[PDB]
Amino acid sequence: SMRKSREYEHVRRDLDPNEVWEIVGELGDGAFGKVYKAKNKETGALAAAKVIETKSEEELEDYIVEIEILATCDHPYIVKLLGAYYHDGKLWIMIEFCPGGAVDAIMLELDRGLTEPQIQVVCRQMLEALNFLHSKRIIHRDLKAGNVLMTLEGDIRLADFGVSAGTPYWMAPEVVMYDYKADIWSLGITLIEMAQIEPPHHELNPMRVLLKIAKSDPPTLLTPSKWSVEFRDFLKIALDKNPETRPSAAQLLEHPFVSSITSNKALRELVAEAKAEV
Numbered sequence: 001s002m003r004k005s006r007e008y009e010h011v012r013r014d015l016d017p018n019e020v021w022e023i024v025g026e027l028g029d030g031a032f033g034k035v036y037k038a039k040n041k042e043t044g045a046l047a048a049a050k051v052i053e054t055k056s057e058e059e060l061e062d063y064i065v066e067i068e069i070l071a072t073c074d075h076p077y078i079v080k081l082l083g084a085y086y087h088d089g090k091l092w093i094m095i096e097f098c099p100g101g102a103v104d105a106i107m108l109e110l111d112r113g114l115t116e117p118q119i120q121v122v123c124r125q126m127l128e129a130l131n132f133l134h135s136k137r138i139i140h141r142d143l144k145a146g147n148v149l150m151t152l153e154g155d156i157r158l159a160d161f162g163v164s165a166g167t168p169y170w171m172a173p174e175v176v177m178y179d180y181k182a183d184i185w186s187l188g189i190t191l192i193e194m195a196q197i198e199p200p201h202h203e204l205n206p207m208r209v210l211l212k213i214a215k216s217d218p219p220t221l222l223t224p225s226k227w228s229v230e231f232r233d234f235l236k237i238a239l240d241k242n243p244e245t246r247p248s249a250a251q252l253l254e255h256p257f258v259s260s261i262t263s264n265k266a267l268r269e270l271v272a273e274a275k276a277e278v
């Protein structure tokens with residue numbers, strides 16, 4: 001019969017990752033597996049290792065397609081794939097360690113939302129990340145505060161996949177009832193999440209969230225007077241229920257809320273603060 005290649009440039013087989021990487025801690029433990037912190041035995045370089053016991057060869061294949069997609073995302077605000085291993089029934093995904101951790105974990109630690117200037121840098125950097133992915137025909141499909149990882153320098157790295165610190169709060173109304181516009185809606189939801197710690201409809205019975213997205217007007221900030229006219233306008237247009245009229249990432253990058261954002265300082269200070277509290 002016609003057959004598929006199992007040779008991929010970014011997946012190495014029959015090599016024990018544990019000969020190359022030392023596990024020095026745990027960063028997360030999701031439904032798909034643990035994420036470890038790892039240190040390279042030869043160089044001391046740091047990585048996140050996401051480790052999955054893949055059941056089916058179909059599953060393995062789906063994941064590897066995603067790894068190979070990530071391998072082509074060379075952008076300064078997207079996590080950097082080192083590479084992957086498949087060993088002993090375990091798929092290891094190695095990413096360049098972002099030591100600041102995830103924005104929502106930072107919010108929960110400090111028990112507060114981001115200032116608007118912090119939200120401005122994250123929004124700006126996310127849109128650049130998105131504009132890049134969409135132009136390579138990549139839909140992210142997984143945007144939320146839990147996917148925004150932080151470096152010490154104060155830049156984001158957008159994670160292809162992440163876990164909140166799974167009710168689908170960020171789902172686009174078109175998907176509720178595959179196109180780049182759905183990522184824009186989820187960005188909008190993510191910004192409210194960063195403004196208010198929790199995304200809209202956090203209080204509801206999770207069984208009602210999708211219903212509520214479908215029937216409701218788009219969500220708005222809870223205390224509008226706390227936020228600039230720019231920010232409220234950005235949300236208004238990003239959170240358009242009609243994907244046709246919803247603006248692209250390219251169009252959003254020219255919105256006054258982010259068009260002038262050139263410095264990461266606001267965010268750099270947030271990571272510094274969260275570093276002292278731990």
Ligand SMILES: CN1CCN(C(=O)c2cccc(NC(=O)Nc3ccc(N(C)c4ccnc(Nc5ccc(CS(C)(=O)=O)cc5)n4)cc3)c2)CC1
Pocket residue numbers: 027028032035047048049050052063064066067079093095096097098099100101102105106149159160161162
């Ligand atoms: C829909 N399905 C579900 C099943 N599915 C997959 O499973 C899947 C399939 C193929 C590819 C991938 N890609 C990845 O797995 N990428 C990846 C992305 C990010 C990281 N992490 C977590 C990284 C990366 C870098 N740095 C950190 N720093 C860090 C430091 C400290 C703290 C702690 S704190 C301070 O408390 O927040 C946390 C983090 N974490 C690891 C791996 C996933 C595919 C789609």
Ligand SMILES: [Cl-]
Pocket residue numbers: 082083084094
């Ligand atoms: Cl590697």
Ligand SMILES: [Cl-]
Pocket residue numbers: 208211212
């Ligand atoms: Cl409802």
Ligand SMILES: [Cl-]
Pocket residue numbers: 229230233256257
């Ligand atoms: Cl405006």
Ligand SMILES: [Cl-]
Pocket residue numbers: 134180181247248249
């Ligand atoms: Cl688009």
